[PDB]
Amino acid sequence: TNTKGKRRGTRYMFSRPFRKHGVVPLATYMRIYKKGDIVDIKGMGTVQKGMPHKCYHGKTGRVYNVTQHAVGIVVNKQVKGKILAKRINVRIEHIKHSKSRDSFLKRVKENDQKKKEAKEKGTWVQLKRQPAPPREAHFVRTNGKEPELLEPIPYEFMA
């Protein structure tokens, strides 16, 4: 049976990308994290302190506590047929701001914009997203040229 070591099987997960070793870019450190911020976890091997366990690399949670160097996150971990919202303390280097929530936050603005707008105009403007509809009926112009013929090429042994 396998071992139960903490960093087991993380040969590539915690490795640095190619030609991206060395000192850590300082913009990661100067990045604010409020409470309730959606945050995705990605362990970095350069900093061995406060690394998340390998079962959270790639998961996304929300911040609930902010200390000097680390943040507390509430992540959902699936454990044999039940989900557990459990708390981890990970140091900033293994942390990114999730851009999954922002496209909703952006969409809220135009919804709040196009509501106060076109209200006094009265024009009812669609707000909900709709799936890609079946494309409309159109005309395809073949001005001049006529569609060139396609025929399967004959086989010829490559090797």
Partner RNA sequence: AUUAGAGGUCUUGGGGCCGAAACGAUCUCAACCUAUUCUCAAACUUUAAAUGGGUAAGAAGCCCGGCUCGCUGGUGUGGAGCCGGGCGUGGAAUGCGAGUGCCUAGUGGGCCACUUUUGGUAAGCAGAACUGGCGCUGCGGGAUGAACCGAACGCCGGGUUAAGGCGCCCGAUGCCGACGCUCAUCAGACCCCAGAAAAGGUGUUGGUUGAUAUAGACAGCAGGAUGGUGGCCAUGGAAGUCGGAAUCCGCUAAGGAGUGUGUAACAACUCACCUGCCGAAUCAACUAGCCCUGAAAAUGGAUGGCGCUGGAGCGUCGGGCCCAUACCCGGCCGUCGCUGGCAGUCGGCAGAGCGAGAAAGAGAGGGACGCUACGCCGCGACGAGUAGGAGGGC
Partner RNA sequence: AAACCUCCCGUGGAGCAGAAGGGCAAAAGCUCGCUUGAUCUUGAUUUUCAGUACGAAUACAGACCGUGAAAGCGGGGCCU
Partner RNA sequence: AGCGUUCAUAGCGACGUCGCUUUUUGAUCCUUCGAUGUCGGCUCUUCCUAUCAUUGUGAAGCAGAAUUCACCAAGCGUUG
Partner RNA sequence: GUCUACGGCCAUACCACCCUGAACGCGCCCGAUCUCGUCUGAUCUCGGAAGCUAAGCAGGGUCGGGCCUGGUUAGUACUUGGAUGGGAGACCGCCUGGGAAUACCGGGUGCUGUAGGCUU
Torsion angle in degrees (nearest 10) through CA of 108, 113, 117, 122: 0
**Full DSSP string of 54-116:** TTSTT-EEEEEEE-SSEEEEEEEEE-SS-EEEEEEEEEGGGEEE-STTHHHHHHHHHHHHHHH
Site string for other proteins, 84-113 (x = CB under 8 A): xx-x--------------------------
> Candidates 37-45, 53-61, 101-109, 134-142 — which segment interacts with other proteins by CB under 8 A?
134-142
Site string for RNA, 60-99 (x = CB under 7 A): xx-----xxxx-x--xxxxxx--xx-xxxxxx------x-
Where on the phi/psi map is residue 68: left (φ > 0), alpha (ψ -120 to 50), or beta?
Answer: alpha
Name which of RNA, other proteins, none residue 159 binds, using a CB cut-off of 5 to 8 Å depending on partner kind. none
- For other proteins, which is the closer residue by CB, 48 or 78? 78
| Binding to RNA, residues 12-41 (CB under 7 A) | 14-19, 21-23, 25-28, 34-35, 38, 40
**Full DSSP string of 114-126:** HHHTTTSS-----
Least Å distance, CB 136 to RNA, is 19
23 token code pair? 């000192």
Binding site for other proteins (CB under 8 A): 1, 64-67, 72, 74, 76, 78, 80-85, 87, 130-142, 145-155, 157
